[model samples]
Target: QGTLLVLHGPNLNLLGTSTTLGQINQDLERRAREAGHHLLHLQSNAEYELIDRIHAARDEGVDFIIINPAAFTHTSVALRDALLAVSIPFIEVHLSNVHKREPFRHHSYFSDVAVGVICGLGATGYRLALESALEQLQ
Candidate 1:
């Protein structure tokens, strides 16, 4: 079985009332395990902490990543580099439609590098990304 990492970035923990992060994680883990894959997750407000997790993912043999970089999507070069440095395929996710928001939100450092991108579907985006990741891993 392959390992899949889910990284949630800044302010995601504060997602108001649609669905809790804990519930989302539980659902994601359950889905991944049902497919015989392992799931690992980390939610962090710190940029370096998420980067550190990405770096460690390589050593831990992580097969794929599903990430919601939150506000960092528009800005973090270091996080993008860390994913590239680890050479892991990833799916970039957004709970909301970034393009419909501020123009700044439309730009992402990870999207160009991601194997796929999911947005505007709220928490379901993560599940869809995982389904795609499972297919890719297969």
Candidate 2:
């Protein structure tokens, strides 16, 4: 199995409050390893922590990234740069369909750089993101 790095930003720490993230992770791990990849999950409300982890991924040799930057999605050039710094392909995930929400929510600094995005499908978005990541790795 290859290695994957998942970064959950801001309010995503409370992922379980709105979605069955555990169930998603179970399916994600199963599908990932079945296709030859291992998943690492991380969550942080602070931008620096998330950025630091992204920097660390290079040393750890992570093959890909899956991030849900939440509010940072529209506003974090620093976080976006950090992802760029790692030179890793990333998938952006949104539990909700941001395009269907407020106007401000429809933008993402990462989207333009993402290999793909999976949104509007709740926790299943992460599952699909992981699956997509595995495909790219293969």
TM-score for each prediction?
Answer: 0.98, 0.91
lDDT of candidate 1 over 1-138, digit per residue (tens): 899999999988887557999989999999999999999999999999999999999999999999999999999999999999999999999999997999988899999999989999999899999999999998
User: Candidate 2, clashing residue pairs?
Assistant: none
lDDT of 2: 0.85
Best by lDDT: 1
Candidate 1: pairs in clash: none
lDDT, candidate 2, 1-109, per-residue tens: 5899878888775667655556666676777777767888778888999999999998998989999898899999999999999899999999899988999998899
Q: What's the distance in Å from true for residue 118, model 1?
A: 0.5
lDDT over C-alpha atoms for residue 55 of model 1: 92
Q: Which ten residues in a row have the lowest lDDT in candidate 1?
A: 11-20
CA-lDDT, candidates in order? 0.95, 0.85
